[PDB]
Amino acid sequence: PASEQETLVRPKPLLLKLLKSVGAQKDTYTMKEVLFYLGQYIMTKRLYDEKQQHIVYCSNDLLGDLFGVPSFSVKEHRKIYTMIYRNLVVV
Ligand SMILES: COc1ccc(C2=N[C@@H](c3ccc(Cl)c(Cl)c3)[C@@H](c3ccc(Cl)c(Cl)c3)N2C(=O)N2CCNC(=O)C2)c(OC(C)C)c1
Ligand SMILES: [Cl-]
Ligand SMILES: [Cl-]
Ligand SMILES: [Cl-]
Ligand code: NA
Ligand code: NA
């Protein structure tokens, strides 16, 4: 039974590299999967303020190259989705 809301995506090379560091290599991922893995990448590289864990600092990491920003709050969903879509194509 199909989820009509699902999004299937093919990541650009740098995003694929970050996904493979934390997760499995696939040709296509779902958006939910990409969001999960990006969050888990931030957790394992400790790219947040220990005292303010909803703020991400990514400028000193490939994630900052991927997103094109030095930092962001996890509340900034439009920004985060927008930067993610700039790093993939929808299948
Ligand atoms: C209080 O500390 C927090 C509170 C909320 C989030 C958290 N927000 C989720 C999310 C979803 C969509 C968008 Cl569009 C954005 Cl912006 C953020 C998700 C996540 C996904 C992708 C990215 Cl890129 C980022 Cl930053 C964050 N997400 C987590 O991954 N969490 C929380 C649940 N379980 C976890 O283990 C980790 C949070 O995330 C950390 C990694 C900074 C911290
Ligand atoms: Cl999805
Ligand atoms: Cl790229
Ligand atoms: Cl914003
Ligand atoms: Na902070
Ligand atoms: Na496409």
Domain boundaries, the chain: 8-86
Pocket test for ligand 1, best of 30, 74, 82 (most atoms within 8 A of CB): 74
Pick left, alpha or beta for residue 27 (phi over 0 → left; psi -120 to 50 → alpha; otherwise beta): alpha
Contacts of 37 (CB under 8 A, 6+ apart): 18, 19, 22, 23, 29
For residue 80 and ligand 1, the question of a CB distance below 6 A is answered with yes
Method: X-ray
Q: Could you give the CA distance from residue 19 to residue 48 in angstroms, rounded to a whole number?
A: 18
Please give the distance, rounded to the nearest whole angstrom, from the Cα atom of residue 9 to the centre of ligand 3: 14
Q: Could you give the CA distance from residue 29 to residue 10 in angstroms, rounded to a whole number?
A: 7
Domain 8-86 has CATH 1.10.245.10: yes
Contact status, residue 56 vs residue 4, Cβ threshold 8 Å: no
Please give the distance, rounded to the nearest whole angstrom, from the Cα atom of residue 90 to the centre of ligand 6: 5
Please give the distance, rounded to the nearest whole angstrom, from the Cα atom of residue 44 to the centre of ligand 4: 24
Strand, coil or helix: what is 47? coil
